[PDB]
Amino acid sequence: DPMVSKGEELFTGVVPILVELDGDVNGHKFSVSGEGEGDATYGKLTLKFICTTGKLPVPWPTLVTTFLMCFARYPDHMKQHDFFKSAMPEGYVQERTIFFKDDGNYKTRAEVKFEGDTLVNRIELKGIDFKEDGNILGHKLEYNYNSHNVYIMADKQKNGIKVNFKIRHNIEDGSVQLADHYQQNTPIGDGPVLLPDNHYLSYQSALSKDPNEKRDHMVLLEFVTAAGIT
């Protein structure tokens, strides 16, 4: 299938990745740059993010979802349901509001597209309404990450998908900080895209530190696999 082969050719090997974020939470401005690689055949991403502005004013785990669904491994039986690769190389817009339970919210807009060989995720984040001494601004989140299933549906109206899901950030009293995600994706180009039947992506994420890195940073390893249509 030349449409499948096309994303299969853009993603059938290891693909360098760049991520650039400009953020403002409760007016605290910060920038982050990330680099790494993705191997869609295996659902694998490895990335290292650096805060280029000094200390990151929010917990690194609250940014994990914002910092590449085109790197999911879609099983061969499910290749018709891969919207994310179908939009490449021109790419897609990914927008979210993330509602933190009893606290503020992030609103993000990202463009995910190729720039030559490199797959770029360029993001603007605004955060509003955070409590000074809540779990976000107070840095009360553990540096770890649970596994989550993400439910994808078509938004045929908008020639894209809608994505909805709740992340649980563990807190160091056994509590969770809920982060309620509402997501919309739409293609950047005017070409054909795959509008999926409802399915999920299963995510696992591991957070770590580069023992040689003095800058505020996060090393992120994620495995992502599509399922949910036998």
Describe the structure using short key phrases.
230 residues; 11 strands; Green_fluorescent_prot; 11-stranded mixed beta barrel; mainly beta; Green Fluorescent Protein; 6% helix
Q: Total number of helical segments?
A: 2
Distance between the termini: 21 Å
**Major beta-sheet overview:** 11 strands, mixed, barrel
Report the CATH topology name: Green Fluorescent Protein
Instruction: Walk across the major sheet and give the strand order.
Output: 1-2-3-11-10-7-8-9-4-5-6
Total strands: the figure is 11
Radius of gyration: 17 Å
Helix and strand pattern: HEEEHEEEEEEEE
CATH-level-2 architecture? Beta Barrel
The level 1 CATH classification is Mainly Beta
Oligomer state equals monomer
Class computed from helices, strands and strand pairing: mainly beta
Estimate the global geometry from the Cα principal axes: globular
* Percent helix: under 10%
Number of domains: 1
The share of residues in extended strands comes to over 45%
CATH superfamily: Green fluorescent protein
Describe the structure.
Helices cover 6% and strands 50% of the residues. It has 230 residues and is mainly beta. It has one domain (1-230): Beta Barrel (Green Fluorescent Protein), CATH 2.40.155. Strand 4 (92-100) and strand 5 form a beta hairpin. The protein starts with a helix and ends with a strand. Energy-transfer acceptor. Its role is to transduce the blue chemiluminescence of the protein aequorin into green fluorescent light by energy transfer. Fluoresces in vivo upon receiving energy from the Ca(2+)-activated photoprotein aequorin. Keywords: Chromophore, Luminescence, Photoprotein. Monomer. This is Green fluorescent protein.
